[PDB]
Amino acid sequence: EPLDLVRLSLDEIVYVKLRGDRELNGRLHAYDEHLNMVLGDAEEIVTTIRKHYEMLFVRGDSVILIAPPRN
Amino acid sequence: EPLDLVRLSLDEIVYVKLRGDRELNGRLHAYDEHLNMVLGDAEEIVTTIRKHYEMLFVRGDSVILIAPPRN
Amino acid sequence: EPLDLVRLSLDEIVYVKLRGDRELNGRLHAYDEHLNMVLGDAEEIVTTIRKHYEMLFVRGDSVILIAPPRN
Amino acid sequence: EPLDLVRLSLDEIVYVKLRGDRELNGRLHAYDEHLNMVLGDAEEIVTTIRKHYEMLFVRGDSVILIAPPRN
Amino acid sequence: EPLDLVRLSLDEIVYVKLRGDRELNGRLHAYDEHLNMVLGDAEEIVTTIRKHYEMLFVRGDSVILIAPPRN
Amino acid sequence: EPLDLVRLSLDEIVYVKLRGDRELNGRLHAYDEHLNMVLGDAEEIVTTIRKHYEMLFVRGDSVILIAPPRN
Amino acid sequence: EPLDLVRLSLDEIVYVKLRGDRELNGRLHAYDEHLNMVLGDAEEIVTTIRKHYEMLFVRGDSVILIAPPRN
């Protein structure tokens, strides 16, 4: 049930809050049971210093929040 | 028995304290054995900077307290 | 044996010390093998800023000490 | 073999060092495989602010050292 | 699926963000289920003090992000 | 193979570095698979405030380094 | 595959980065699946205060990086 939110966000642009002052935005291309994700066209925001990635692998362990697009 | 409190809070508005100066309020739409939750119409409060989400996935690992709505 | 202390505290008012400058007092309504608890009429004390809850779910992982009421 | 030390200290007054500036002294009434303990007539020392408990449950995870009384 | 990104990066030059102010760049020679990696011709950047290694073993546990080379 | 060093140190005086500014010296009387030890005639050094114990139980989880006596 | 690097470093002089400002250099005499190592003629560097050991046991849990000698 709770993971349904991540699953319905496949190919949508998600917001991800990681542990310790880091955030991401990107298109969810893939995820797994551990909450590992691959984000496409991703922006990383340390707070502000930004960084952009064509493809980004995010380690599940460090994910705190995931929000789908308003849509 | 203790998880009964989370279970009876399905569709109620819960308060959630996370690790490290973060709090949430939202409608509990879903949870699992790991204490992962989906919160609807959720407010995040870092302390104070606020943020609002239509739908929010919260990682169970970071949950310290959950309080149901009063009455 | 050691968990007997928590068990005999069912419905008594317990003191709970959590990781990192947080404490609780409340009536133990429920607990489980992970040391998750539901505390009734609970006070949370960060040190001092206080907060009160009619019903509180506490995540076992963060519990360091539990003391039953005196006598 | 190493746990024998804790076992032989049953009913003796043990010193316990916990993670992060905390110490205990008390009569070992019970312990388990996780190193959870119940300490009787226990003194807690944060360093110095002291606190006393008639009975105290200590979570095993946070125990770093245990010393038995000097015979 | 998400690990596919690491797998398709075999022999490419990857960027790796580790916990706590450390980054790496190097040629991915090997990885495993734990996300342990061996990086060839690797640069380590603490932030800035740099360090270079002909071959580097990175512990999986400390990996937060992995980004494959562009284009 | 690596644990052989701990095993050959039985009854020798070992140095032990724990997490977070703590060190021990003592006679290794016992150890287990978790790296729990009992140290005899042990000195604990926080850095410098020292403390001495006739018998000391050390929790394996917090052990970083173990050095056997020279020769 | 990734552990091959550690394995091929048997009897070579390796550099090891541990968690939290600590480094080691020594001759790799032994290692195991957990990444526990015994380092011979080892130097420990906290950053700078140095320390030397004839034989050193290193707990695998705290190892972040391992680099074999050049060529």
Residue numbers in the entry:
A (entry chain E), B (entry chain F), C (entry chain A), D (entry chain G), E (entry chain B), F (entry chain D), ...: 9 to 55, 70 to 93
What is written in the article reporting this PDB entry?
Structure determination of SpLsm2/3 was attempted at a resolution of 2.7 Å. To our surprise, only SpLsm3 was identified in the asymmetric unit (AU). One possibility is that SpLsm2 was lost during crystallization as the crystals were obtained from the heavily precipitated mother liquor. The structure of SpLsm3 was solved by single-wavelength anomalous dispersion (SAD) phasing method using a SeMet-substituted crystal. Residues 1–8 in the N-terminal and residues 56–69 in the loop region are disordered in the electron density map. In the SpLsm3 heptamer, the Lsm3 subunits are assembled one to another to form a heptameric ring via the interactions between strands β4 and β5′ (where ′ indicates the adjacent subunit) in two neighboring subunits. A dimer of heptamers for SpLsm3 observed in the crystal lattices is apparently induced by the crystal packing.
Sm and Sm-like (Lsm) proteins have been found in all three kingdoms of life: bacteria, archaea and eukaryotes. They are essential parts of ribonucleoprotein (RNP) complexes and are actively involved in various steps of RNA metabolism including pre-mRNA splicing, mRNA degradation, telomere replication, histone formation and translational control. Members of this protein family are characterized by two closely spaced, conserved Sm motifs 1 and 2, which adopt a conserved Sm fold that consists of an N-terminal α helix followed by a twisted five-stranded β sheet. A common characteristic of Sm/Lsm proteins is their tendency to form a hepta- or hexameric ring structure.
